[PDB]
Design a protein around this ligand. Structure first.
Ligand SMILES: [K+]
Ligand SMILES: [Mg+2]
Ligand SMILES: [Mg+2]
Lengths: 136, 177, 52, 50, 75, 116
RNA sequence: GCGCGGAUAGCUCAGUCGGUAGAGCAGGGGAUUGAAAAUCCCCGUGUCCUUGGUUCGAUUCCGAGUCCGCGCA
RNA sequence: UAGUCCGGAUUGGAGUCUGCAACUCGACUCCAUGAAGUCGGAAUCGCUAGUAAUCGUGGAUCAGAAUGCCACGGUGAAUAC
RNA sequence: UGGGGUAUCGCCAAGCGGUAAGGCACCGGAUUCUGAUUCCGGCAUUCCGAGGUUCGAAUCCUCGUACCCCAGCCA
RNA sequence: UCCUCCUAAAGAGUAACGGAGGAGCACGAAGGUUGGCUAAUCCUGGUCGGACAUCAGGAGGUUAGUGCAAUGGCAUAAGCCAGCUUGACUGCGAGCGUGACGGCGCGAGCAGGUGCGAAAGCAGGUCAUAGUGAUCCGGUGGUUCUGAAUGGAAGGGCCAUC
RNA sequence: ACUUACCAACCCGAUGCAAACUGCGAAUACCGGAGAAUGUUAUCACGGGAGACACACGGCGGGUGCUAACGUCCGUC
RNA sequence: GCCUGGCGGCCGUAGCGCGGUGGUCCCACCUGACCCCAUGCCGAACUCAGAAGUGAAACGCCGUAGCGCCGAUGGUAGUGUGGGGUCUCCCCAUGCGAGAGUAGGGAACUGCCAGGCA
């Protein structure tokens, strides 16, 4: 599980998730798993999907996780009233918008990249698509 | 002024001959000679730094400037602005007189003298050496020493490269093993 | 230089066993007897016996 | 805190006093300040670090 | 462990550009010298900039550091 | 840099005199000349200028660039400035110490009637 | 199901920035003794529960399991 | 009255002898070096008169190797209610 | 989970911001036929781990760890 | 209770048992002025000297510093060093800001007297924003302002102050 | 002094994130000035009388909550 | 007209870096220091008396875009008002309209005074 090594403040406000994404082209690799839905992704979903990919295209290839969590999500325990402070940091999410290339892959044929990205897009909560490295 | 005159004829002429300078002023000249004695054991004793100051007062012909600590560091048990060394900036006539006594009578009185290292340039020609005894200067009375106190000399010159400082200093014959 | 805070720096005459009579300014305040000078010190013979 | 209150009294015949605060521990010496005396209308020496 | 904040100090620009002032009027109550004093403007002890002559407030950008002066045009 | 150090020494009094709005007598000392010029309160335009590079001053001097030369220049700026209706200036020493020949120049300008 | 403490030599247990596996007892060899006990010295083929992964290298770090025990609306 | 002209350990250099052979691993000499040690904690030992103490000399073993052992003499006590 | 306390030589336990004190033990000597007792000498913890304030931290502050004590209620 | 940032929606203000930190002082120089100076860190060379105490040179640019939080400032330095000093003055104050009010804040200039500077000038505390407590009651010093027949006094007032 | 499947500072190239980051920066809002039309002075000051200081939902911007609540706390309509 | 010095406007299309050049005057380094003055040591700096020497450094000027810097058009984001949906987010009409990036521009421009040369 991914999590920043050392923050600056422990608890972040909710804020909103509007507009489109910045990481949009397949930059590092050759094939990409790009988001279409909005959503947000916990570190467990990123790890689950990465294991599905790494298993699927065996220890050949090279995989880039282009998103990183760095946003702490706090929850209140059970049978605790409202108020009395902000909750506790339970997990860490990345906020996703439509357009984020969530993962990249290189060093495989396209048909294995289809296969691993299908296998791993079923571990994520957002609708997802397959993209290739377009040249300009 | 003996080595200053010797400079003004034969070292200027000699270095204009060796290196193919155009300007007569492009030649290296020695700017200053700083004598530091960074005592450091004066964290507990003040008369020890006073005796150090008397020794640099004897070796050069000037009062030294008792230097203070720039930062506080705990590795050596000091504090900000605590007096920890003393130095004399010799320049002008006294630079040449001290340089004459140094290369003439002080350097040969070094114990087990093999020569001064030629790789003691800081890249910009400026020599720096260290003596381990203050006894090697003929002024320091051998019967009046209490602590052995070396010091470090630094010849600062206007040469750009350090081979150019090899040339400048070596034209005073300045031993160079 | 300032006034009298500096030690008295008067010209003296040093003389070693090499016959090198050499007058210099030094704040000893006394004439000087030496053995080794820059002239006739075993520096080059010293390096030779070192390597040899 | 530790820093006490003192009266700088005038050296002229008036009773006029300025008032201020002194660290009594680190500076035990008395405090003399040539302040302005508005009864004499003149800058007079003031004394009495209490 | 939290739950405290100071009282709001009501800083900022009190008279804007072109706004006619009397002498003595505070123009920018502020905290450092975010705005510097220009012609006919004084800077108080807490870096309050006040109209030293009558006229109109003139915000400008001068000098090699692109500082934000405040002049007053005589009017 | 020596020149840049001098300018940053000058700057406070320069900007203060531009803030007050006083006509300033800017001096300028060089190892063989002294220069003196009276500048309007807008700072752009000069009014009066004398210096030792002018042959009207330089011919009657032994050496341009000592205290006698500077006293001659101060006398000249005071004379020309009184001829052009300027009476009360403020002395901009322009980064030099008010000690040597800038003191000689300014004293000479005060003897010959220029009010500062 | 959740929160914990355990699995290291035949036995009973130690063991944190990852560095060639530790102790006591047991067992074996030697010294000693008439002989033995005792005492002293020497000696460990331990998948450090299984299995993957990280590292040059894992008892030790991460991921997932097996068994034992303690507690829980 | 000093760690000193005490003390001689240790160490460097230069040697002599014996012995096929002195590196491990001799003895002695010369020059240089010059530690520790200033009368020894608890405790403990020997001695009753030519004794203890102290000073030298010899011998056996042995090519060479004793501060040990076995002998020999010189000076020579104290104390025992 | 909150509040309080403790962590200092092998063990129990003192430490005042400028130095680490005690007892038992352990090591060496002595007494003793030998061991225990006894007697004479010693040693000894850079102070739980990390960061900070200070010229300077065992000492002060903050965080983590490990162990104790008190509370965790009315419905 | 008070200070700083965010929430706070680009003027001000703006809530919650919202997220984070600090204050209840220090200073007679750490204030005033005049004159001067410019950091951190790293590299190289150099007696003891070491990763890091002093020296010299270079790179670097304020990543430094600002008596103490944070923000905004600061090179003309508000940072650092030295000389002389008491403006850390007294009476006022055009005009403003800010509060329901009590109150709080900024202030050119006027008068008297002063410091620094050759002078222009600057100085009514500190780079700024925290470092605090109304009234009553009472204590101390000054001032005939009052002073229950009258002259005093007591007490009260006023100014300073605890 | 000799080797090395391990990690990795700084620097450079490329990629993201930030309420308490900003070498950039709107719309809107706000303040000020001028001008026309319209509005039963709608504005300000002073004086008499109040009431009210439990708000609710709905849009938009947010905090908290689980972007849960016909939840809670603000800003604005 | 060219060059240099001073004081400004302007505040990176103006600054950096690399390369070339200048000294008759100017400027800078320089020469000396007992004096005016100065160094918590030192004429290094400050200051004074000068002018032998060099333009080496510095500074100015001329080139050079390696970088910094400026920067459209178009599109995108956002957003005021009105409306709509599948409504934690978007769409429509309409008004405003970036930041980044691209083409490109780009090694400044200028006022007063003074001196030297033609
Ligand atoms: K064992
Ligand atoms: Mg077992
Ligand atoms: Mg166990």
């Amino acid at each position: 599980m991914l999590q920043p090594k050392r923050t600056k403040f422990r608890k972040m406000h909710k804020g909103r998730n509007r507009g489109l994404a910045q990481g949009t082209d397949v930059s590092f690799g050759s094939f990409g798993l790009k988001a279409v839905g909005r959503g947000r992704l916990t570190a467990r979903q990123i790890e689950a999907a990465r294991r599905a990919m790494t298993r699927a295209v065996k220890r050949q290839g090279k995989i880039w996780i282009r998103v990183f969590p760095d946003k702490p999500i706090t929850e209140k325990p059970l049978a605790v009233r409202m108020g009395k402070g902000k909750g506790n940091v339970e997990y860490w999410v990345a906020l996703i918008q439509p357009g984020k290339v969530l993962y990249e892959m290189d060093g495989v044929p396209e048909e294995l990249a289809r296969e691993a990205f299908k296998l791993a897009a079923a571990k994520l909560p957002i609708k997802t698509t397959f993209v290739t490295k377009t040249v300009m | 002024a003996k080595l200053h005159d010797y400079y003004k004829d034969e070292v200027v002429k000699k270095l204009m001959t060796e290196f193919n300078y155009n300007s007569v002023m492009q030649v290296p000249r020695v700017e200053k000679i700083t004598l530091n004695m960074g005592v450091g054991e004066a964290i507990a004793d003040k008369k020890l730094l006073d005796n150090a100051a008397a020794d640099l007062a004897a070796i050069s012909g000037q009062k030294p400037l008792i230097t203070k600590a720039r930062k506080s560091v705990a590795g050596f048990k000091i504090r900000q602005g605590y007096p920890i060394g003393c130095k004399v900036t010799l320049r002008g006539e006294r630079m040449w007189e001290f340089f004459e006594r140094l290369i003439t009578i002080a350097v040969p009185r070094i114990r087990d003298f093999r020569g001064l290292s030629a790789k003691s340039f800081d890249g910009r020609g400026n020599y720096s050496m260290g003596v381990r005894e203050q006894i090697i200067f003929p002024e320091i009375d051998y019967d009046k020493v209490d602590r052995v106190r070396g010091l470090d000399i630094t010849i600062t010159t206007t040469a750009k490269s350090d081979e150019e400082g090899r040339a400048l200093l070596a034209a005073f014959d300045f031993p160079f093993r | 230089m300032k006034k009298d805070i500096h030690p008295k720096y008067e010209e003296i005459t040093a003389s070693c066993s090499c016959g090198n009579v050499m007058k210099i300014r030094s704040t000893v305040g006394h004439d000087l007897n030496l053995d080794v000078c820059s002239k006739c010190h075993p520096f080059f013979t010293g390096k030779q016996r070192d390597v040899a | 805190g530790i820093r006490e209150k003192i009266k700088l009294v005038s050296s002229a015949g008036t009773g006029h006093f300025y008032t201020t605060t002194k660290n009594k521990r680190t500076k035990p010496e008395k405090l003399e300040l040539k302040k302005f005396d508005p009864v004499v209308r003149q800058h007079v020496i003031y004394k009495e670090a209490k | 462990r939290n739950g405290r904040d100071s009282e709001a100090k009501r800083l900022g620009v009190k008279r804007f550009g072109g706004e006619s002032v009397l002498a003595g009027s505070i123009i920018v109550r502020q905290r450092g010298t975010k705005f510097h004093a220009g012609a006919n403007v004084g800077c108080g002890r807490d870096h309050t900039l006040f109209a030293k002559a009558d006229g109109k407030v003139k915000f400008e950008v001068k000098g090699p550091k692109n500082r934000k002066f405040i002049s007053i045009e005589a009017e | 840099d020596k020149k840049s150090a001098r300018i940053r020494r000058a700057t406070r009094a320069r900007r203060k005199l531009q803030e007050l709005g006083a006509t300033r007598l800017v001096v300028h000392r060089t190892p063989r000349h002294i220069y003196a010029q009276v500048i309007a309160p807008n700072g752009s335009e000069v009014l009066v200028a004398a210096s030792t590079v002018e042959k009207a001053i330089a011919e009657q001097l032994k050496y341009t660039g000592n205290k006698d030369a500077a006293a001659a220049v101060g006398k000249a700026v005071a004379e020309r400035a009184l001829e052009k209706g300027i009476k009360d200036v403020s002395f901009d020493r322009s980064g030099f110490q008010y000690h040597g020949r800038v003191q000689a120049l300014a004293d000479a300008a005060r003897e010959a009637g220029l009010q500062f």
